[PDB]
């Protein structure tokens, strides 16, 4: 299965299930992304995380 790896997602651990009829991988279908989230990157971006049941400012 020889084909150029020239999409804008080559170089990531995300899994894709694509269909292509050409040698150019940027032509492929969008596919199914991996359903992974990182909510604590925007919602709890603190150095020393604190527990729910605790008081945050001790």
């Amino acid at each position: 299965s020889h084909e150029n790896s020239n999409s804008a997602t080559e170089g990531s651990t995300i899994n894709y299930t694509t269909i292509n009829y050409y040698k150019d991988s940027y032509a492929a279908t969008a596919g199914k992304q991996s359903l992974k989230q990182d909510p604590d990157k925007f919602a709890n971006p603190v150095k020393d995380i604190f527990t729910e049941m605790a008081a945050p400012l001790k």
């Binding site: 279908t29 919602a43 945050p56």
Partner: protein, 242 residues
Amino acid sequence: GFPTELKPGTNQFLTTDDGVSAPILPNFHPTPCIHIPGEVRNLLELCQVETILEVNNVPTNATSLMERLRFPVSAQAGKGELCAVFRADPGRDGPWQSTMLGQLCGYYTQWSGSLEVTFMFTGSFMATGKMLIAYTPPGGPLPKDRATAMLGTHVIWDFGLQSSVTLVIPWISNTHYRAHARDGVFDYYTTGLVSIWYQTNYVVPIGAPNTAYIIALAAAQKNFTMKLCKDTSHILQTASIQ
């Protein structure tokens, strides 16, 4: 000469069609990617962030649009007065339209899961007081007094070192998902009401200011989901762009 016969669904451009298309540049390898911080993988990462709720959407002139983000609490006569009330419908037109939940749920049609409002007190340290934050589920009209609003879900909040409390508006629906409420047949989908009542009073010593302000912060929980992407409705565009 392989035999084929064309079915209907042909020579049409469906915008939500995901198919393979013809490239213009062969053997093009694009620029490699670096580590940029902030990789958004799912839009539900952004609904869990706490954004300001414009409960006090009374002022209209341009000179008083910053009075719209905080609502006051003052010294009352201790009858269990009413401070503020606001509907809990995010896709509806009101306070939630000033959130990143109420602007992204405009691009979706059907939502599910719990919410959470997070009030924060910006008064003095020497000030104390208590408030009742009641979620009145649907059917309940605007409560006339505090004796009825304690029947719904509620939280009693004591000002202190921790200046903030969370009212987790929970998921109480007949449906699995609910669409956006509006005036008419679609009021069947309303989420309820959220009222704030003076439990005791706002007590203040001498020399401190007699009026404070509360900042509400709205977000979502880990069970929140959205469905059936659409075009946002609560923003327009006058023509002659450029």
